[PDB]
């Protein structure tokens with residue numbers, strides 16, 4: 001191209017362009033105010049428009065990296081606000097861009113982003129939609145500088161949709177706040193997913209990843225040949241290693257290039273890519289990424305044939321180990337989209353260990369003949385846990401289910417901070433909600449996607465502030481063994497209970513006027529501190545206090561003098577518990 005700027009602007013459109021440039025600048029220049037970014041974006045946009053007009057005009061032939069970096073280094077407060085980031089401006093590309101990526105603050109020192117009241121948001125949205133949406137895009141972007149800018153642009157659009165629908169509704173808060181809660185929880189899941197994926201690559205390496213991708217891609221495109229899968233596994237690895245390096249343009253290009261190839265070769269991959277591959281560039285890769293599983297081939301044999309009975313089983317494993325175990329994952333995974341990727345890796349790891357031992361032994365077939373008998377319990381364990389948890393989730397509600405997990409987990413690892421025990425337990429209720437409503441097939445995949453995010457975030461938090469050597473064990477295990485380890489954690493016997501604190505169990509009239517979430521988290525917080533104070537307390541003894549307290553609030557939130565009711569009946573109820581259980 002004569003101008004990289006012009007072509008990108010033309011490709012994206014003025015809106016998407018202005019939006020992405022705003023996210024880009026906000027992720028580097030995290031401490032600068034919104035107005036300063038809008039100034040930069042307007043300047044970079046006018047420059048693009050002049051190049052679109054005259055592609056042979058001044059500076060238009062420069063690389064996007066050079067132009068962005070040059071504009072980054074115009075910023076007056078650069079050395080003032082970041083001392084050794086102004087030292088990046090002394091460097092040529094691509095050392096300068098590398099320098100800029102290495103000076104992004106993973107956690108900036110910015111105040112908690114507060115959600116205004118529904119009426120304030122809806123008025124701001126009505127009165128000035130663009131400023132309200134763009135300021136909050138900037139506020140999120142600067143707090144998550146490694147969040148993939150296009151993905152963040154998609155959330156911004158889904159947020160715009162929620163407001164457009166609900167700010168004209170009869171009951172606005174009832175329409176909007178559930179949607180904003182969902183999008184906040186999907187947004188967090190996305191950032192956590194990006195972190196996990198890249199942390200996993202950096203740690204376990206390209207080989208470990210290739211095993212994951214084979215499994216995943218084989219489930220998604222079962223009608224594709226092992227060759228075509230392997231080819232995509234290779235490309236996707238390049239796409240993944242870049243992106244995880246953190247450059248927006250390289251990552252965007254690589255995802256764009258792969259999406260083009262996938263769409264030009266649909267017939268050799270999948271039939272569900274049709275509509276995805278009619279969508280625009282930015283949406284193309286995202287659509288493909290979130291595309292339905294293709295129907296598995298009608299006529300498929302049993303793996304037993306080529307992976308046990310075949311003459312050349314041990315010959316094939318000898319010739320090329322990784323490729324053969326690669327074929328094993330491919331054949332098993334494509335027959336089982338109902339399986340978690342980690343489950344498939346356990347079967348592959350188990351099959352590997354079997355071939356290692358047996359192909360040495362005198363009669364190989366005799367040895368690994370019953371290899372599938374070892375796969376039965378590995379498959380059955382997660383299938384049981386999911387059904388056992390979805391039964392309980394339905395018998396109770398999400399809330400009462402969260403409370404069940406809360407007691408279960410507090411008793412297992414009570415050294416974890418209350419807010420962590422609460423948020424983890426709450427999040428696993430949300431996993432219960434989403435995944436148990438999916439049909440039996442899509443359940444284990446669903447559970448994996450969210451558990452991976454929940455467990456990794458807990459482990460990240462644990463890395464910072466460690467408490468239990470058993471959480472450190474599960475967190476330092478292989479990703480394949482991480483969930484079963486956590487599942488395996490037993491009730492803590494050695495733990496000495498927490499000292500009683502009067503204020504921890506002191507409740508006020510405010511609890512009556514709090515939103516459902518605010519109320520739930522306060523009650524759940526106390527339920528943890530109760531279990532921490534009395535871990536030997538029986539299932540009967542816990543629901544007794546939980547029922548007694550439920551009657552306490554429901555009575556005292558109907559009283560004419562509510563604050564006095566909570567003071568009076570509160571010290572009464574707490575005292576009755578100190579008798580029922582102990583001080």
Ligand SMILES: C[C@@H](C(=O)O)c1cccc(C(=O)c2ccccc2)c1
Pocket residue numbers: 182184185186187188189192427428430431434450451453454457
């Ligand atoms: C609703 C659902 C989702 O994402 O659709 C979900 C499932 C599990 C956890 C979370 C979540 O909120 C989370 C995000 C980041 C760190 C920890 C937990 C959200």
Ligand SMILES: C[C@H](C(=O)O)c1cccc(C(=O)c2ccccc2)c1
Pocket residue numbers: 113114115121132133136137138140152155156159180181184
């Ligand atoms: C995440 C935060 C919340 O839920 O407290 C929030 C509250 C209200 C509005 C917005 C947005 O407009 C927005 C803009 C761009 C991307 C994502 C969201 C975000």
Ligand SMILES: C[C@H](C(=O)O)c1cccc(C(=O)c2ccccc2)c1
Pocket residue numbers: 112113139140143144147152155183184185186187188191
């Ligand atoms: C709202 C809060 C903050 O920004 O302080 C927060 C905490 C964690 C993750 C995220 C996100 O990445 C995100 C992205 C898009 C929409 C919603 C959330 C946001």
Ligand SMILES: C[C@H](C(=O)O)c1cccc(C(=O)c2ccccc2)c1
Pocket residue numbers: 409410412413416421424428451458483486487488489
């Ligand atoms: C999947 C597994 C389960 O549901 O069996 C699970 C998921 C989340 C957490 C835990 C914990 O043991 C735990 C307990 C206390 C603090 C932190 C983690 C276990």
Ligand SMILES: CCCCCCCCCCCCCC(=O)O
Pocket residue numbers: 340342343382383385386387389390428431432435436444447448451483484
């Ligand atoms: C069904 C939703 C609630 C989830 C509760 C935890 C149960 C364990 C899930 C097992 C599947 C995870 C993937 C795996 O370990 O193979």
Ligand SMILES: CCCCCCCCCCCCCC(=O)O
Pocket residue numbers: 403505523524526527530545546547549550573574577578
């Ligand atoms: C000294 C103990 C004081 C009371 C402890 C607080 C109990 C928390 C109850 C959590 C659940 C209440 C709601 C419900 O079960 O319907």
